[PDB]
């Protein structure tokens, strides 16, 4: 009678985020020279579920042959009817649910939701681990308060909701304009690591030419502005609210 436990990485998650599960159930170490599997049978089922969708008879595998620790991972996917980008064509996050392996799990999700993992280690007893799924606001700032008239600009935006692929680096367009040219440019920011959700991009400062691509026409003591439109915003806001987060810096020589 070695009780089992379920642990999850984060108390709160985000949509399209990657979950790792660790079940410490020493009593299921049947063979000392074999990596033991739990959850694939009617006798010993597991099920990972969110409100609306579930994966049943999922599989978890032992870390080493006689360790007695079982692990797995599932990829959240969100719902296909949304624009996280705000560019006007939907299907930013494919809503798919499949897989019965230790690692190849795909699970659909809602904007505000809950996740649970259930394990029946013995008949008529279960153990559960739960977590929340919430959207998040964006955070935007320039790296430096002041820049020279001929320097280069990098701006950092932090929105965990924009991690559309947790195993890949993601890119989206921030808008950059200055007092001299209100039209400005569209800054393509990119993810530093495949699942960090931190984005950065680079702009050239010109004074004697048009603002095009990542070049921005500016002048002495001219404040520059970069704004991010948060299409993925939690309560009190709704699924339709489009809040704008922006940051500014002054060019003084």
Highlighted features:
253 residues; mainly beta; Immunoglobulin-like; nine-stranded mixed β-sheet; six-stranded mixed β-sheet; 20 strands; structural protein; Nmar_1547 S-layer; Cell surface protein
Secondary-structure blueprint of this entry?
Elements (H helix, E strand, L loop, with lengths): L4 E4 L3 E2 L4 E7 L12 E2 L7 E5 L2 E4 L3 E3 L6 E8 L28 E3 L5 E10 L2 E9 L5 E4 L3 E2 L4 E7 L12 E8 L6 E7 L6 E9 L8 E3 L4 E9 L12 E9 L2
Parallel strand pairs: 2-11, 8-9, 13-20, 17-18
Antiparallel strand pairs: 1-3, 3-8, 4-7, 5-6, 5-10, 7-8, 10-11, 12-14, 14-17, 15-16, 15-19, 16-17, 19-20
Structure description:
The chain has 253 residues and is mostly beta strands. The chain folds into two domains: 5-133, Immunoglobulin-like, CATH 2.60.40; 139-251, Immunoglobulin-like, CATH 2.60.40. Helix content is 0%, strand content 45%. The protein contains no helices and 20 strands. Strands 12, 13, 14, 15, 16, 17, 18, 19 and 20 form a nine-stranded mixed beta sheet that branches. Strands 1, 3, 4, 7, 8 and 9 form a six-stranded mixed beta sheet that branches. A hairpin with a 6-residue loop joins strand 7 (60-62) and strand 8 (69-76).
């Amino acid at each position: 009678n070695f009780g089992a436990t379920v642990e999850l990485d984060q108390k709160v998650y985000s949509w399209t985020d990657k979950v790792y599960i660790t079940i410490v159930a020493p009593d299921h170490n049947f063979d000392s020279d074999l990596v033991d599997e739990i959850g694939e049978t009617d006798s010993d089922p597991i099920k990972v579920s969110t409100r609306g969708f579930d994966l049943d008879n999922y599989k978890l595998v032992e870390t080493g042959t006689d360790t007695g620790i079982f692990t797995g991972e599932v990829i959240l996917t969100g719902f296909t009817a949304h624009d996280a980008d705000g560019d006007g064509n939907t299907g930013d996050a494919t809503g798919t649910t499949s897989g019965s392996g230790p690692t190849d799990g795909l699970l659909a999700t809602d904007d505000d939701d809950g996740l649970t993992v259930s394990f029946e280690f013995s008949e008529d007893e279960t153990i559960v681990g739960s977590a929340l799924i919430r959207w998040n606001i964006g955070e935007v700032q320039w790296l430096e308060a002041s820049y020279p008239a001929s320097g280069t600009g990098v701006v950092r935006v932090i929105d965990p909701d924009m991690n559309l692929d947790p195993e890949a680096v993601d890119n989206f367009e921030v808008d950059v304009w200055s007092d001299s040219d209100a039209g400005g440019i569209d800054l393509t920011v990119t993810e530093t690591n495949e699942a960090t959700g931190i984005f950065e991009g680079t702009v050239f400062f010109t004074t004697l030419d048009e603002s095009s691509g990542h070049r921005l026409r500016v002048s002495e003591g001219d404040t520059v502005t970069a704004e991010y439109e948060d299409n993925t915003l939690p309560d009190p806001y709704t699924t339709a609210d489009e809040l704008d987060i922006t940051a500014t810096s002054l060019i003084g020589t």
